[PDB]
Structures are given as C-alpha cells and as structure tokens.
Design a protein around this ligand. Structure first.
Ligand SMILES: *[C@@H]1O[C@H](CO)[C@@H](O[C@@H]2O[C@H](CO)[C@@H](O[C@@H]3O[C@H](CO)[C@@H](O)[C@H](O)[C@@H]3O)[C@H](O)[C@H]2NC(C)=O)[C@H](O)[C@H]1NC(C)=O
Ligand SMILES: *[C@@H]1O[C@H](CO)[C@@H](O[C@@H]2O[C@H](CO)[C@@H](O)[C@H](O)[C@H]2NC(C)=O)[C@H](O)[C@H]1NC(C)=O
Ligand SMILES: *[C@@H]1O[C@H](CO)[C@@H](O[C@@H]2O[C@H](CO)[C@@H](O)[C@H](O)[C@H]2NC(C)=O)[C@H](O)[C@H]1NC(C)=O
Ligand SMILES: *[C@@H]1O[C@H](CO)[C@@H](O[C@@H]2O[C@H](CO)[C@@H](O)[C@H](O)[C@H]2NC(C)=O)[C@H](O)[C@H]1NC(C)=O
Ligand SMILES: *[C@@H]1O[C@H](CO)[C@@H](O[C@@H]2O[C@H](CO)[C@@H](O)[C@H](O)[C@H]2NC(C)=O)[C@H](O)[C@H]1NC(C)=O
Ligand SMILES: *[C@@H]1O[C@H](CO)[C@@H](O[C@@H]2O[C@H](CO)[C@@H](O)[C@H](O)[C@H]2NC(C)=O)[C@H](O)[C@H]1NC(C)=O
Ligand SMILES: *[C@@H]1O[C@H](CO)[C@@H](O[C@@H]2O[C@H](CO)[C@@H](O)[C@H](O)[C@H]2NC(C)=O)[C@H](O)[C@H]1NC(C)=O
Ligand SMILES: CC(=O)N[C@@H]1[C@@H](O)[C@H](O)[C@@H](CO)O[C@H]1O
Ligand SMILES: *[C@@H]1O[C@H](CO)[C@@H](O)[C@H](O)[C@H]1NC(C)=O
Ligand SMILES: *[C@@H]1O[C@H](CO)[C@@H](O)[C@H](O)[C@H]1NC(C)=O
Ligand SMILES: *[C@@H]1O[C@H](CO)[C@@H](O)[C@H](O)[C@H]1NC(C)=O
Ligand SMILES: *[C@@H]1O[C@H](CO)[C@@H](O)[C@H](O)[C@H]1NC(C)=O
Ligand SMILES: *[C@@H]1O[C@H](CO)[C@@H](O)[C@H](O)[C@H]1NC(C)=O
Lengths: 238, 99, 366, 86, 35, 49, 50, 34, 50
C-alpha cells in the first residue's frame, strides 16, 4: 500500500574529491608496528565521489556510502536487480530499535517511504512479501559522519561501518579512519542495483562512491590500529 | 659525533644479512603447485596416496630455496673474509711500524 | 656417539657435534565454544517424501554440531563416494555454510552424478561443477517408493534448448518444439511435453528400481568456521610444551599469559613472515602467547682418546631447567652458550685449550 | 622443510645426503668468522698498561685512552661508535 | 632482444682519457709531491 | 620465461619471490662495476695540463 | 593441459636462469679482486717510487 | 630531455658543470637546487 | 598464414629466392615473412620496452 508523489524532486549530482577516505580492515589478524602490503578492492585515492542534495544506481563490484547525517533521517537500503516480486530482493531497515534484514521477493513501488506520525508507527514501503528467505535482527546502527562499505563476493554480503563526530560544514574531512567490520551475511544473490530509504514527514545530502581492485600499503601501530596508508598506483613516488 | 651515515659499510652488511634471512623465512608461505601452503592441513585433510605427491612438491620447492640461500651466504662469507685479511694486513703494517 | 659420527675408533682432542634434541609434547588440549545443538540429519536423511530430480531439494545448514560416524558406519548406503577429502577424516574438520541436496533417480543413473560427466540427467536436470568438493551418497528405495500399480509421481526433464550451467534449477513446463512448426501449447506431432515420468515397479530389475541420492557440498576457508565435528572440549594447561587445536587452528608450543591488547573482532595475530604468535581461546575470550618448544644441538668436549676417556656434554642455547642417564651426573653449569655438564667451574683464568664460547672454555686436569 | 613430521622426514630420507653437506657449510662459515676476528685482533703476546701519570710531551690522549670510570672500560670514541650504529 | 638489456657506463672514455692525461702531466711535471 | 603471456605470469607468481631476488643481484653487480672504475681511475682532485 | 606444458617450460627456464646468475656472480667477484689489485698497483707504482 | 641512456622527464637541463650527486649515466647526472 | 606474433613491421630490402617463405636470423627467431597477397618481403622487430 504505497502511492506515487506529485513533486518530482531533483537532487543535484555534485562531484567532489575523496582525499584519503575509504579504508577498511581487510582480515581478522592482529599486527603491531608493521608495514603490510595487500591487494584487494578499495576506493582509489583522490577519486570523484558523487553528492546528492532516491534514483536507482548500479551496485557493480562494491559501494561506499557516506552521510553527514543529523538526527538520523536515513533508515535503510534496498538491494536487487528488478526490485519486484519476480526476483529475490534484500531489504535493510534501521528504525529506533534493533535493525531488521529481510531477504524476500518484495513488491516495490516507485518511492518506498516509512512516514512519521505526530507514537511512531507506519510501514508501507512495499506492498506484498510472498516468499521470504532470510531474516536477521541485531543492534541498531544509529554532525554525525556515518561511513559504510558494502561488498558481495562468493555469496557473502560484507558490510563495514564507522561513526564519527564532525564539525565542518560541507567539505569531506581531510583525515584518516578505518572502517571496522560490521556484519557478514551468508546469502548468495545476484544484486546489481540499490536504493536509499527516507522517512518523510507524514505529519537528503550524502556521498557515494565505487570500488576498484588495486594494491595498498597499510601501517599498523603498536596497538594494532591502522594509522596510515599509501596507494600504489597513484604516483611515481607512490 | 655529529655527522650521520658515517658507518655505511657495517650497516649495509647487517641489512643484507637481515634481508636474506627475511626472504628465506618468507619463502615458506608458497604453494609451489600443491593445494595448500601448510603441511598439517594436507596431512589431516586427505588420504596419504596424494599426500605423498603434495609433500614431494613442498620438499622440492623448499630444497631449492634453501640451496639458493646457502650459495648466497657462501659468496658473502668469502667477500667478508677477503676484507678481514686486508684489515689484518693494515693492522700489522700501519700500527706496529711506519709504512 | 662421537666415534660413530666421526667414523673412527680414535678421536682427537676437541669439541664435536653429534646430533640435536627437542622438547617433546606431553599432552593435548582442545578448546571450542560451548555450543551443543545437534545438527539435523534425520530430517533430510530419514525424511518421508523426496522431491523429483528436476526439482532437487536444496537445504543450507550452518551453525550446528554434526556427526558423520552415524553416516559412515551404516551399511544401508549403496554408494558412499567423497571427492574433496578422505571419508574417515570428516570428523576432524570444521566448516560453515554447508549445502545438502536430495532427490530420487533411476537405479542405473547413479554413475551420471560425478564431476565432468555427461548423459541425460547430468546435462538437463543436475550438473556437478568441475571443481566440485564434497561427497555423494546413494542408496536403495525399492521397497519404499514402488507400488504394485507403479509410481508415476516422480518425473524428470527430457528436452531443453541447450545445456545447464552447474548448480541451476529449472522448473518451467513449456511445450518443446522439435520440428519446424509452432505448437501453440498443443501436444501433438513433433511437439512433446518436456517432462517424463518413471514406471517404478517391484518387478523391475536393477537399473530401474528407484534410488535415493543426497549430495553434500562443503567450503574451505571463507570465514570463521561454525559447522564443526564431534569434539569434546578440554581444560587449559599453561607453561608446558604441548600441542593445541584452538577452534581448528592447530600447532605445538608453549602457551603463556599475554599483555597484548586486541580489538573486539580478532581471534589471533602474527608478528612477521606469517608466524602466528597470539590466539584468543573461544571459551574464556583470553589472549595467550605461543612460544616454540626448546630445541638445540648437542656437543661433546673431549681431551683425546689417546689420554683419557671422560667427556663433557654441552647443550647449545638451552636454559639449564629442562635438560632431560646424564640428567644430573656431576656439577651442572649454566653459561651464556647454554648448559654444560661433566666439568667443574673455577675462578682461575688460563690459556684457552678447547674453545667453548661467550669468552669461556675448558681444559683437562678431570 | 618438515616441521616435526614423520611422513615428511621419511619422504625426504630417500633423497640421499643433501642436508649433511647443506648443514656442514654454515659451521665452516662460523669458524671462519671466529678465526677472522682472532687473527685480526690477537696481535700481541702481553697486555700493556700506561703509567698512572700521563705527561706525553704535551699531546693530550684522554680521548682515546680507556675510561676506568665506565663499566664497559671503553674510551669516548669507542662508546660513540657503539651507540651511533643501530 | 627477448628481455635482455645493456646499460651504458657512467664514465665515458673521454673523461677516462682526461684522467690519464692529468695523471701523466702531474707525474712528469711535479714528480711525486702532487700525490 | 613468459614472453608476455597472462597464463604464464599467473602460473609463475605462485612460485614465490624468486625473480625479485634474481633482479636484486644484477643491479648490485652494475653498481660494483661503476665503483670499481671510479676508484681505480679517479685518484686526483685537480685536472692538470 | 597447456598448464602442464607451461609448467615444464617454466621450471626448465627458471633453472637455466639461476645457473647463469650464479656464474655471473662468481665472475663479478673475480673481476672485482683484479680491479682492486690494479688500483693498488697504480696507487703505489705511479704516485711514487716502489 | 633525451640522453644516450634514454629519455628523462620532469627535469630541466643546464649548461654548467658541477659535481655529481645522483649519477645517471653516459657521463651526465642530476642534482637539486628544482 | 598461421604464424602469429606481435611487433612492428617495416619494408625490407632483404633478397629472398622464390622458394623461401620466411627468414630467421638465429635462435629460431623469425625476422622476415612473405605475405601471400603481395609476395613482398617485410621485416618485423619487437615493440620497445624498458
Ligand atoms: C534413521 O532411522 C534409523 C532407524 O531408527 C536409524 O538407525 C538406527 O539408529 C539408532 C540410533 O543411532 C541405532 O541405535 C543405536 O545402535 C547402536 C549400534 O547398534 C547401539 O550401540 C546403540 O545402543 C543404539 O541402540 C540403531 O542401531 C540404528 N539401526 C536400527 C536398525 O535401528 C538411523 O540412524 C536414522 N538416521 C538418521 C540420519 O536419522
Ligand atoms: C545478474 O543480473 C543481471 C541483470 O540484473 C544479469 O545481466 C543480464 O544478463 C542477460 C543475459 O545475457 C542480458 O540479456 C541482460 O541484458 C543483462 N542485464 C544487465 C542489466 O546487465 C546477469 O546475467 C545476472 N547474473 C546471474 C548469474 O544471474
Ligand atoms: C512464491 O512461492 C509460491 C509457492 O507456492 C509460488 O506460488 C505458486 O506459483 C505457481 C506458479 O505457476 C502456481 O501454480 C501455484 O498455484 C502457486 N501457489 C500458491 C500461490 O500457493 C509463487 O509463484 C512464488 N512467487 C513468485 C514471484 O513466483
Ligand atoms: C522497530 O522495528 C521493529 C521491527 O521488528 C518493530 O517491531 C518490534 O520489535 C521489537 C524489538 O524486538 C519487538 O520486541 C516487538 O515485538 C516488535 N513488534 C512488532 C509488532 O513486530 C518495532 O515496533 C519498531 N519500533 C518502532 C517503530 O518504534
Ligand atoms: C597504545 O596503548 C598504550 C598501552 O595501553 C597506551 O598507553 C597508555 O595510554 C593510556 C590512555 O591515555 C594512558 O593513560 C597511559 O598512561 C598510557 N601508558 C603509558 C604512557 O605508559 C597508548 O596511549 C595507546 N596509544 C598509542 C597511540 O600509543
Ligand atoms: C632459566 O629458567 C628460570 C626459570 O624460569 C629463570 O628464572 C626466572 O628468571 C626470571 C628473569 O629474571 C624471573 O623473573 C623469574 O622469577 C625466575 N624464575 C625462577 C623460578 O627462577 C632463569 O632466568 C632462566 N635462565 C636464563 C639464563 O634465562
Ligand atoms: C685533554 O682534553 C680534555 C677534553 O678535551 C680535558 O678535559 C677537560 O678539562 C676541563 C678543565 O679541567 C673540563 O672543564 C672539561 O669538562 C674536561 N673535559 C673532558 C671531556 O674531560 C683534559 O683536561 C685535557 N688534558 C690535558 C692534560 O690537557
Ligand atoms: C653556444 C651554446 O652552446 N649555446 C647554448 C645553446 O646551444 C643551447 O641551445 C641553449 C639551451 O641549453 O643554451 C645555450
Ligand atoms: C569530477 O569530475 C568533474 C567532471 O565531470 C570535474 O569537474 C571534477 O573536478 C572532478 N572531481 C574530482 C576529480 O575530484
Ligand atoms: C561454556 O559453558 C558454560 C555453561 O554455563 C557457559 O556459561 C559458557 O559461556 C560456555 N563457554 C563458551 C560458550 O565459550
Ligand atoms: C698418543 O698416541 C701415540 C700412538 O698412537 C703414543 O705413542 C703416545 O704415547 C700417545 N700420547 C699420549 C699423551 O697418550
Ligand atoms: C670459586 O668458584 C666457585 C664456583 O664453583 C664459587 O662458589 C666460589 O665462591 C669461588 N671462590 C672465589 C674465591 O672466587
Ligand atoms: C589474390 O592473391 C593473388 C596471389 O597473392 C594475387 O595475385 C591477386 O591479386 C589476389 N586477388 C585479389 C582480388 O586480392
């Protein structure tokens, strides 16, 4: 039970720099005060990250999602190919309580939406859920810079997360921080596209980037926390 | 006391030895054509009639690496011995007398 | 030993090297998280109804404690053929995300279920990948799935445009046109129904009696394994040379308390050159340190067979704490080079006769 | 190459004697290092000591003479060399 | 050429000849004091 | 040993770091040759005429 | 099967290259010794009387 | 710049003659000033 | 004509004789070919690398 919208709102597709963000722990090994070189999927340094002020975008190999969020408006995401009951679909939601991950052939309309009523109770993002596969519930995920990394390899859906308090207004911070692993889902899907979830006031600025396979060098301090990195295919000095 | 990089020769000899040991110990993490890089896994995962082949591949690869390391060590030792002979001659001539 | 290694009945004065020694392990320890749910196999092996081969039933099993002895000892299984690993060793491993597929096929078709195999079912109903790892089980169901009137509820695909990629499911029932004229969903000349049914009868000879087939697919090293075998957890000894099997990761050494500070999502760590040195036990969630068990070469110091026959024994780079008939012997001395037995220390200083190391050496008197 | 494994040792055993001579070289290398140091430095028969008073015609040798105050019994330049290199 | 290369020497022949000429002039004129 | 073949490179890279240390010696040889020439000929500080 | 053939070629060529490298190392060491002898000869018998 | 040793980019050549800091080859080498 | 490989091709003045189809210099390295369509002689040299 969902409807269309009159205002075909336009979010300007801004382009800006990535600087030195988009680094995550690749394995489950503790290393102290050592330089380690590894080749994997990463976001290239000083790339072009896109800025929105929920159109369908390709998933490709993997995605990186950043939000300079205030008050935690965003609720979740949708994953699939055709986004209908014909094809198996994935849906992640994070309301005020524990998160919900569903793997079902949801019937999706144009603009899914959660609504807020002015005592928070409304859920009509989709219409029908015929055949469900997997269900997951865990702790809730949510000025506030939230960074997420989504990957899907050999039937495994890996999600990495990082939270930071920020004070700068517009530009992406020129700092370094590694995204600790968040969750892995042992379900194999042929996902190719993704969406964004907004809880409109029933009484939008974020950054997105892609990934590429390349080699990096990481530095581990005495306490086993990543503190610096270097991208190989960036410069002759690199 | 002040100038740096005044002891390059000893430092580079030590660095060469450390690098040789490091690469030799690093060479143990290669498949060499087998199914795994660790011996216990292949011993505990399958029937000996194939474990012999896997162990044979591991043995030949590791033997080659060890032989290469030994040859390099011999060459470096010969060079060091020649340098030591030169130093001994200088000590005998320019200290216990006037050259 | 010196005479044997030197290959002579006479020995000149000096120090010689004979062999090596090591500290052997004493006992074994295994640590596993206390998970006791029994992994469900009866619901898939002792089930009542089995789906047809063209609709093979697939189940994903994870996070369970499974036993394979009950499968291995039973004689009811006609074919028990495992590919990736030896059968007798499935009880000694751990995985996650295991797959079980079940169906029923003709008696003669069991050979068609094999990697890199061709036939009718093998390329139209079920396909095994060329890199398949796992095992296949087949047994008899003549007295369970055969009626005097004949069972016709089991079917299989007979026609398709092309082959099937490995591990695919097809359920579409559309008229197949083998001729050069549209059929418009009318079963007639040169227009055959894609499915066909079996004629299982108790009088049918072998190669026609129905068989029940289940295949198990494993994985190796994609995540921290959760589908372990029937292992009994043990206690934790410390400060002794033993071997360990921490959650499947095995190795020998001595375990000590550690002050290393992990991060809440690792289980083990390494220093350099892929040498694991730290582990976290699943039960206590405590970080430990692994040190290789002591080892070293042995040396014999002799003043010459021509003079006497008493010798001294040196262990290189070994603390005089665990040496072991020469366990106590005479006054045992500890040196920067290791431990020396068979000689008496003095406070004198003479010319060096038989160099030993670290600025010290021995001589004859004793 | 075996890491305390009986099967690996048995399989290696049928390669003849390679590791005997492989192990027989490092010991020779160590002995060469020892004899090199001994022949380079042991050039005198007796240890000499300077007189307690030092009046060497005006030359000041305090920089090179050993320091009994330091436990290492090393001179200033020797300590500088020992400390500078890592 | 199938993967093998030759690098040029750092010092050309001209500077080698220059050094030889300088040494020869120094030893003819100044004897050995210039050493 | 490969002659611009992707399959050959993929097969080779599982043999370990043989080629890095193989290449690490010829450069040292070349530097040693240069040092030999420099120390055998550059024995003067001023060019005479 | 090209995998097996390329494996054979790879091992043979690698062994040959290793042998060549070892020979080059020995010859370079000998050349360096000769260069040192030449250098000391020129230093002693040119810049002064021997 | 094009030299007997190959092609060098990112550097500017001069007509002076100094001591050698970083040897390059063919009797020429570079230094820092740029 | 079934002989495959990479490189750069130039006009050549090498003198074939009407029964030769290709020419190699040493170590079975083909250097010249005669194209079936034109019956002319070419030279092939490897692309630069370093
Ligand atoms: C499917 O059902 C059959 C029939 O019950 C199971 O076979 C039977 O399993 C039980 C339990 O494991 C066996 O009982 C035990 O047998 C051993 C060996 O004789 C004995 O030492 C124990 O004290 C206990 O009695 C039983 O022998 C075995 N066979 C029969 C004819 O009953 C089978 O295990 C089931 N399979 C699955 C996957 O559920
Ligand atoms: C995963 O989904 C994509 C599309 O969501 C599939 O790509 C399609 O493949 C067919 C078959 O060649 C093409 O006709 C379509 O044009 C493709 N669409 C797109 C958007 O690329 C892909 O085949 C799927 N993969 C699997 C393994 O199911
Ligand atoms: C979800 O699964 C159900 C399983 O019942 C599918 O429903 C069946 O679909 C077939 C298609 O021909 C019908 O013949 C059956 O009558 C349906 N059974 C019902 C409705 O109980 C359903 O098709 C699946 N979803 C999708 C999108 O295919
Ligand atoms: C947030 O979403 C959950 C999704 O399950 C809603 O459902 C409740 O979740 C809590 C937490 O486990 C359960 O204890 C309740 O029983 C669930 N209720 C129902 C009806 O399923 C939850 O209500 C949502 N919270 C909001 C909207 O404030
Ligand atoms: C790395 O870990 C060490 C050891 O825990 C930290 O050192 C201590 O840090 C706390 C927190 O500020 C101080 O209260 C202690 O006084 C520190 N111990 C000392 C100085 O001996 C260290 O801060 C951590 N981080 C870094 C970057 O080293
Ligand atoms: C040989 O082992 C003993 C036993 O561990 C060592 O003695 C320990 O030494 C450490 C370091 O001084 C002390 O902290 C312990 O209290 C000592 N324990 C005992 C029981 O004596 C001894 O130091 C070791 N020898 C060498 C040369 O390392
Ligand atoms: C030799 O030189 C040392 C230092 O160059 C002299 O020692 C210094 O003496 C002065 C005056 O007594 C002190 O202020 C310095 O602190 C001393 N320095 C050191 C390093 O000892 C020493 O006196 C000189 N000896 C003679 C005989 O002239
Ligand atoms: C007389 C002479 O050589 N003049 C040179 C000229 O040839 C060169 O092109 C220019 C740039 O380097 O510098 C000056
Ligand atoms: C992104 O691309 C646009 C052109 O499409 C360009 O103007 C902008 O500078 C780029 N931003 C980067 C590279 O950070
Ligand atoms: C071991 O079992 C005890 C029994 O209560 C439990 O408290 C403990 O958590 C278990 N250890 C684990 C799960 O690592
Ligand atoms: C050493 O042996 C020889 C004969 O083998 C013997 O003549 C000589 O006396 C012996 N010397 C000592 C000190 O025993
Ligand atoms: C002599 O050495 C022994 C060790 O065997 C020691 O116990 C004793 O105190 C020493 N005596 C003197 C006077 O140094
Ligand atoms: C066909 O090939 C022959 C021999 O190479 C040549 O003489 C002739 O011109 C060619 N004809 C065409 C149409 O290419």
């Amino acid at each position: 039970q969902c409807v269309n919208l009159t205002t075909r709102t336009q979010l300007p597709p801004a382009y800006t720099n990535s600087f030195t963000r988009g680094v995550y722990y690749p394995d489950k090994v503790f290393r102290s005060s050592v330089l380690h070189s590894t080749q994997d999927l990463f976001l290239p340094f000083f790339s072009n990250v896109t800025w929105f002020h929920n159109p369908v975008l390709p998933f490709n190999d993997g995605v990186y999602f950043a939000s300079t969020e205030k008050s935690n408006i965003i609720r979740g995401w949708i994953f699939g190919t055709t986004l209908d009951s014909k094809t198996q679909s994935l849906l992640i939601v994070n309301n005020a309580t524990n998160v919900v991950i569903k793997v079902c052939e949801f019937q999706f309309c144009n603009d899914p939406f959660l609504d807020v009523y002015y005592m928070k109770s409304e859920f009509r993002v989709y219409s029908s859920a015929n055949n469900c596969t997997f269900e997951y519930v865990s702790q809730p995920f949510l000025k506030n810079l939230r960074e997420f990394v989504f990957k899907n390899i050999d039937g495994y859906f890996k999600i990495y997360s990082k939270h930071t308090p920020i004070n700068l207004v517009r530009d992406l911070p020129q700092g370094f921080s590694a995204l600790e692993p968040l969750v892995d889902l042992p379900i194999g899907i042929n996902i190719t596209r993704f969406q964004t979830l907004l809880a409109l006031h029933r009484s939008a600025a974020y950054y997105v980037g892609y990934l590429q396979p390349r080699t990096f060098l990481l530095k581990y301090n005495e306490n086993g926390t990543i503190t610096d990195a270097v991208d190989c295919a960036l410069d002759p000095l690199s | 006391s002040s100038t740096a990089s005044a002891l390059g020769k000893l430092q580079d000899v030590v660095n060469q030895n450390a690098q040789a040991l490091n690469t030799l110990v690093k060479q143990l993490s290669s498949n060499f054509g087998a199914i795994s890089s660790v011996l216990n896994d292949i011993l505990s995962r399958l029937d000996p009639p194939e474990a012999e082949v896997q162990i044979d591949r591991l043995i030949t690869g590791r033997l080659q690496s060890l032989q290469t390391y030994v040859t390099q060590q011999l060459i470096r030792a010969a060079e060091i011995r020649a340098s030591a002979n030169l130093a001994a001659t200088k000590m005998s001539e320019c200290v216990l007398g006037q050259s | 030993e010196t005479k044997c290694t030197l290959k002579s009945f006479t020995v000149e004065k000096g120090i010689y090297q004979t062999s090596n020694f090591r500290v052997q392990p004493t006992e074994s320890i295994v640590r596993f998280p206390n998970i006791t749910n029994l992994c469900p196999f009866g619901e898939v092996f002792n089930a009542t109804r089995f789906a047809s081969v063209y609709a093979w039933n697939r189940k994903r099993i994870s996070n369970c404690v499974a036993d394979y002895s009950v499968l291995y000892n039973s004689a009811s299984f006609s074919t028990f053929k495992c590919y990736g690993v030896s059968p007798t060793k499935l009880n000694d491993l751990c995985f996650t995300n295991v797959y079980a597929d079940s169906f029923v096929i003709r008696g003669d078709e069991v050979r068609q279920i094999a990697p890199g195999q061709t036939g009718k079912i093998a390329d139209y109903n079920y396909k095994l990948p060329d890199d398949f790892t796992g095992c296949v089980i087949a047994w008899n169901s003549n007295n369970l799935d055969s009626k005097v009137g004949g069972n016709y509820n089991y079917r299989y695909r007979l026609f398709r445009k092309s082959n099937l990629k490995p591990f695919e499911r097809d359920i579409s029932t559309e008229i197949y046109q083998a001729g050069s004229t549209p059929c418009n969903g009318v079963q007639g000349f040169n227009c055959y129904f894609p499915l066909q049914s079996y004629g299982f009868q108790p009088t049918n000879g072998v190669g026609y009696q129905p068989y029940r087939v289940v295949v198990l697919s494993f994985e190796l090293l994609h995540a921290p394994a959760t589908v372990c075998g029937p292992k009994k957890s043990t206690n934790l000894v410390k400060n002794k040379c033993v071997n360990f099997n921490f959650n499947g990761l095995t190795g020998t050494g001595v375990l000590t308390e550690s002050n290393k500070k992990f991060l809440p999502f690792q289980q083990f760590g390494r220093d350099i050159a892929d040498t694991t040195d730290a582990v976290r036990d699943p039960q206590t969630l405590e970080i430990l340190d692994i040190t290789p068990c002591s080892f070293g070469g042995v040396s014999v110091i002799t003043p010459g067979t021509n003079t006497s026959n008493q010798v001294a024994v040196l262990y290189q780079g070994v603390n005089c704490t665990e040496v072991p008939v020469y366990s106590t012997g005479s006054n045992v001395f500890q040196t920067r080079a290791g431990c020396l037995i068979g000689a008496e220390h003095v406070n004198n200083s003479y010319e060096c006769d038989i160099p030993i190391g670290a600025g010290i050496c021995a001589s004859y008197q004793s | 190459i075996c890491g305390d494994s009986t099967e690996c040792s048995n399989l290696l055993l049928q390669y003849g004697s390679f590791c005997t001579q492989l192990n027989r070289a490092l010991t020779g290398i160590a002995v060469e290092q020892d004899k090199n140091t001994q022949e380079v430095f042991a050039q005198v028969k007796q240890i000499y000591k300077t007189p307690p008073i030092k009046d060497f015609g005006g030359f000041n040798f305090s920089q090179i003479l050993p320091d009994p105050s330091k436990p290492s019994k090393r001179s200033f330049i020797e300590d500088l060399l020992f400390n500078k290199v890592t | 050429f199938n993967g093998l290369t030759v690098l040029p020497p750092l010092l050309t022949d001209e500077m080698i000849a220059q050094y030889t000429s300088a040494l020869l002039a120094g030893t003819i004129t100044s004897g050995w004091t210039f050493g």
